[PDB]
Design a protein around this ligand. Structure first.
Ligand SMILES: [Ca+2]
Ligand SMILES: [Cl-]
Ligand SMILES: [Cl-]
Ligand SMILES: [Cl-]
Length: 526
């Protein structure tokens, strides 16, 4: 009995949004998985979507795999460089390619974000069956603005570009809502499976990523729930994180840093609309969880769930971006949205609204961590994760053992009884995994998969981190940080509040050495 796999990825879901991670959002299906399984409080991704996904499916660093930066930010000084191709590339072999070789039915419904051309599709990279959004985002209902020269760059880069296998779709199914479509499709594939062989089911939702949109009936259930604002929410989340044992009672949360007005400085109409966006966000997360529950309910009724290794994670920190703030060259976003969408209060959450919830709502969900998505601080890279598989010894608990997204490919190969092919595959030199199999740790033979000498690097958008054991050095450039290395003891200071660069210069110098090894071994160009 080799197990099935179900790998579910939420897009920009915050650490404490789910019930079992301290949240007020109704997420019964994930809660059941989480509490029965093992909740990870020290699991890490990259600081953005496509780099994480590249890592999840290869077991190595994103700077090797083709996503050295995000496809959308490829300049002339990076384009051409090895591992900056903007898609999953020729120097790695993807997890599903390997499982498919070894008998698995490879099934996917969700966001891809690992390439847009036929040769880069889930179908080209080892999925037998796939229903996929190829870009990093799109309107959840398939409502499209006009595409021409006057269109903001962020919109141009996020069309509703869907493929099913090799067919680039002409229209979308009737009543399309991304999360429901992905649920419908994976369920179709699972119902149509060869019941006698195992599956690798990949369910990368695009919820709860902007634009924030969800069925009215679900939005209505959160009416008034967020009227006290993101700081009142953050305080709630912190108290619950402590009560549940996910964060230690004495942890000091990092201060909230945002350039927007705080809740109490907002006019009544601005508040109502910002609260409505968080309600919509909450609805997206509940609807995602509902779709996950349809998938899981079917597996359970088939007698397969207990023999399915279930991994759930978010792909990066909660999204605190202000889309209007980035001097993305080209046409003005807000002015465009003003002419083509309706963001009045009663419309927010529909197909022809386009909202994001901004930095303070995001910091409520990353707390006690510092900042949010696209930073290399813990806010942007520490994400919620659960593993549910009853054969493992470590279930029903909260673990603070360090782990990364690079661990997942090796863990799953290990469980499938498939050896990584080493340095060659299909007549081509390839990278080997930098992660480590969780199986020792999760079977109870070891206390963790890594130890005090494990070294890990992150690098994206000009930011850096390097970690050894619990010691982490961070580099944030201007204007969002001091453009120097700061040193943190994550065991004592999970908030990354107390810079120890002057107190422990030897420790810092050691980490800077590791940082350079990282740069040279993964091919970081900054
Ligand atoms: Ca994401
Ligand atoms: Cl329904
Ligand atoms: Cl309780
Ligand atoms: Cl525990």
């Amino acid at each position: 009995k080799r197990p099935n796999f179900l790998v579910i990825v939420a897009d920009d879901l915050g650490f404490s949004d789910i019930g079992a991670f301290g949240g007020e959002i109704a997420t019964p299906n994930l809660d059941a998985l989480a509490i029965a399984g093992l909740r990870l409080t020290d699991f890490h991704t990259a600081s953005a979507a496509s780099p994480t996904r590249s890592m999840l499916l290869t077991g190595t660093d994103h700077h090797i795999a083709g996503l050295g930066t995000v496809a959308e930010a490829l300049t002339p000084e990076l384009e051409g460089k090895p591992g900056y191709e903007g898609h999953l590339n020729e120097r790695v072999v993807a997890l599903p390619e390997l499982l498919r070789e070894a008998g698995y039915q490879t099934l996917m419904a969700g966001k891809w974000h690992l390439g847009l051309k036929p040769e880069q599709t889930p179908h080209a990279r080892g999925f037998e069956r796939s229903f996929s959004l190829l870009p990093g985002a799109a309107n959840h209902y398939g409502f499209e603005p006009p595409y021409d020269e006057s269109t903001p760059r962020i919109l141009k880069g996020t069309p509703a570009l869907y493929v099913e296998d090799e067919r680039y779709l002409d229209t979308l199914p009737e009543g399309f809502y991304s999360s429901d479509a992905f649920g419908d499709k994976l369920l179709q594939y699972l119902k149509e499976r060869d019941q006698s062989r195992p599956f690798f089911a990949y369910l990368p939702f695009s919820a709860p990523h902007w634009p924030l949109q969800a069925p009215r009936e679900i939005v209505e259930k959160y009416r008034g729930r967020y009227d006290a604002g993101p700081e009142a929410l953050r305080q709630e989340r912190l108290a619950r994180l402590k009560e549940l044992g996910l964060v230690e009672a004495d942890v000091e949360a990092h201060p909230v840093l945002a350039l927007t007005r705080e809740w109490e400085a907002l006019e009544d109409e601005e508040r109502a609309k910002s609260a409505r966006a968080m309600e919509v966000y909450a609805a997206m997360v509940e609807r995602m969880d509902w779709n996950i529950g349809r998938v899981v309910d079917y597996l359970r009724r088939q007698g397969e769930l207990d023999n399915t290794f279930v991994l759930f994670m978010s792909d990066n920190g909660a999204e605190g971006a202000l889309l209007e703030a980035f001097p993305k060259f080209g046409p003005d976003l807000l002015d465009f949205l003003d002419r083509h969408y309706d963001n009045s209060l009663e419309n927010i959450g529909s197909a022809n609204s386009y909202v994001w919830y901004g930095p303070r709502w995001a910091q409520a969900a990353t707390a006690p961590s510092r900042l949010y998505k696209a930073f290399t601080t813990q806010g942007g890279i520490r994400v919620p994760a659960l593993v549910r598989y009853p054969r493992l010894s470590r279930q029903g608990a909260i673990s603070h053992a360090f782990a990364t997204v690079m661990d997942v490919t090796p863990t799953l190969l290990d469980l499938a009884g498939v050896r990584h092919p080493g340095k060659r595959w299909r007549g081509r030199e390839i990278a080997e995994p930098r992660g480590r199999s969780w199986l020792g740790w999760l079977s109870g033979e070891t206390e963790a998969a890594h130890d005090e000498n494990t070294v890990t690097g992150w690098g994206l958008f000009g930011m850096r981190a390097i970690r050894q054991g619990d010691w982490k050095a961070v580099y944030l450039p201007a204007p969002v940080g001091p453009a120097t290395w700061q040193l943190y003891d994550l065991a004592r200071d999970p908030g990354e509040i107390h810079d120890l660069a002057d107190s422990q210069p030897g420790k810092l110098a050691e980490l800077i050495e590791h940082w350079k090894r990282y740069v040279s071994d993964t091919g970081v160009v900054e």
